[PDB]
Enzyme design. Structure first.
Site, PDB file in Angstrom:
ATOM      1  N   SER A   1       0.823  -1.204   0.000  1.00  0.00           N
ATOM      2  CA  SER A   1       0.000   0.000   0.000  1.00  0.00           C
ATOM      3  C   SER A   1       0.860   1.257   0.000  1.00  0.00           C
ATOM      4  CB  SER A   1      -0.955  -0.016   1.198  1.00  0.00           C
ATOM      5  OG  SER A   1      -1.940   0.993   1.088  1.00  0.00           O
TER       6      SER A   1
ATOM      7  N   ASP B   1      -6.612   1.824  -3.045  1.00  0.00           N
ATOM      8  CA  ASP B   1      -7.859   1.623  -2.318  1.00  0.00           C
ATOM      9  C   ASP B   1      -8.247   2.833  -1.481  1.00  0.00           C
ATOM     10  OD1 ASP B   1      -5.895   1.131  -0.404  1.00  0.00           O
ATOM     11  OD2 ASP B   1      -6.818  -0.745   0.296  1.00  0.00           O
TER      12      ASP B   1
HETATM   13 MG   LIG Z   1      -3.989   1.151   0.310  1.00  0.00          MG
END
Ligand SMILES: [Mg+2]
Ligand SMILES: O=P(O)(O)O[C@H]1O[C@H](CO)[C@@H](O)[C@H](O)[C@H]1O
Length: 448
Positions: A97, A241
């Site tokens: 991430s 995300d």
């Molecule tokens: Mg993320």
């Protein structure tokens, strides 16, 4: 001890001491024993080590008789989407991430992209991996490559009426993560003019790790908005995300206000629906949901709690102040793409700027932003806060740490489930002075 890479919600650790190809292969073997019948979707982010970790996962899954569906380089939400869309037994996204260069990790889901977390299978996998000294078997199942994004792109586009979109000028900042690929595949179907910042995927991250919360990274988006007269700007973390919004003045919009704004946007399409929200900052969301005809549903923060509450409630949308937005039609999963499409549609249809869509809400419910504290004794610090305010008799709620409602102001104070931190959020009823004095008072008590 136990393997440090296994956290509450996912796997994340430094390569190669906390996470490596051997561990990834053993995770594949253990995951196969935890899932119902079916194939397993695998995807990965732009990090340099991600493809090799995915290959090792695939080797372990296939040695355990699982067919693998390799969706290739992708965002985390694409693993969620394809796991559900292809009716797979589960999926794994290889990603760290927004974490440093020497880190990687995995996010694991089962059927319908339901999360696998510490108490719902992830620590069972950890314990199996920890004890597994078996020789690696050989594959008894196949891997098929399925990189077609058509269904995913059509699903994203289904959230907006493309005939109502205006040719807004939008800054997009992938931070050299993966979001630019999806922007470019959506662009032929949208009227927007894109101003592309840090657009090319590059796991060396020459412009910094993809964390739009770092002020230096924030400022690249803001500067591109201001210098180009863009309607608004959008930035993502590396696996996209999470998305982050900048109005036409370059101002970063605090994620709290996006929950109410997106809820109103969705409730126009799905009247009367339920909307799940977290307890850290609440008043604005409850009001905006109710004024749009929806029903707000309070839920502990944390994506797995949010998703399970949305499922139990048939909720159309859930949102956390921490830039997580979840959509029933998207397998109840989070997307960093759906939110900006909805906002672009709202700006197009309303004729209002993003700034004006939120300005009155920010004035009506000003908030501290999340403030994090690393203290010597979190429990004693929380007790100091509650003892100081006891004489005011706040209304107390224990959904997620402690929420205390004093009438014209409230706070939430809770331990993080992903870091050894206390997190504070304060909001008031239109009173910026009270917001500051109470925030500073609590901060002094926590640091005492
Ligand atoms: Mg993320
Ligand atoms: O560390 P926390 O605060 O417990 O959890 C944090 O990461 C979770 C997963 O990304 C989010 O769902 C939470 O909203 C966020 O605050």
């Amino acid at each position: 001890m136990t393997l440090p890479a296994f956290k509450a919600y996912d796997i994340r650790g430094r390569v190669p001491d906390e996470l490596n190809e051997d561990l990834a292969r053993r995770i594949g073997v253990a995951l196969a024993a935890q899932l119902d019948q079916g194939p397993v979707v695998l995807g990965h982010d732009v990090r340099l080590a991600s493809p090799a970790l995915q290959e090792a996962l695939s080797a372990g899954l296939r040695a355990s008789g699982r067919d693998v569906i390799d969706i290739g380089l992708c965002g985390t939400e694409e693993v969620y989407f394809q796991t559900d869309y292809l009716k797979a037994a589960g999926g794994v996204m290889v990603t760290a991430s927004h974490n440093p260069m020497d880190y990687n990790g995995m996010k694991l889901v089962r059927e319908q992209a339901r999360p696998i977390s510490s108490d719902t299978g992830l620590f069972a996998i950890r314990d199996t991996v920890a004890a597994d000294t078996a020789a690696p078997g050989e594959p008894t199942a196949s891997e098929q490559s399925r990189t077609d994004k058509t269904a995913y792109l059509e699903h994203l586009l289904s959230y907006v009426d493309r005939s109502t979109l205006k040719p807004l000028k939008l800054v997009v900042n992938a931070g050299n993560g993966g979001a630019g690929l999806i922007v470019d595949l959506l662009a032929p179907h949208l009227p927007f003019e894109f101003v592309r910042v840090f657009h090319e995927p590059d796991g060396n991250f020459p412009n910094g790790i993809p964390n739009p919360l770092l002020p230096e990274n924030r400022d690249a988006t803001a500067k591109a908005v201001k210098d180009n007269g863009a309607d608004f700007g959008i930035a993502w973390d590396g696996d996209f995300d999470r998305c982050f919004f900048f109005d036409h003045t370059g101002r970063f919009i605090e994620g709290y206000y996006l929950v109410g704004l997106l809820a109103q946007a969705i409730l126009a399409k799905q009247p009367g629906g339920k909307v799940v929200h977290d307890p850290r900052l609440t008043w604005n969301t409850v009001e905006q949901v109710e004024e749009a005809g929806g029903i707000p549903v309070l839920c502990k923060s944390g994506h797995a709690f949010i998703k399970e509450k949305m499922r139990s409630e048939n909720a159309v949308y859930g949102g956390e102040m921490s830039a997580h937005h979840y959509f029933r039609e998207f397998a109840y999963a989070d997307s960093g793409m759906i939110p900006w499409l909805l906002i672009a549609e709202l700006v197009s249809q309303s004729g209002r700027s993003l700034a004006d869509l939120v300005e009155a809400r920010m004035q009506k419910f000003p908030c501290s932003g999340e403030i994090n504290f690393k203290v010597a004794d979190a429990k004693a610090s929380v007790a100091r806060v509650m003892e100081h305010y006891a004489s005011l008799s706040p209304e107390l709620d224990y959904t997620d740490g402690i929420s205390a409602d004093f009438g014209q102001w409230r706070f939430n104070l809770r331990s993080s489930n992903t870091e050894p931190l206390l997190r504070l959020n304060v909001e008031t009823r239109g009173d910026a002075a009270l917001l500051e004095t109470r925030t500073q008072e609590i901060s002094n008590l926590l640091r005492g």
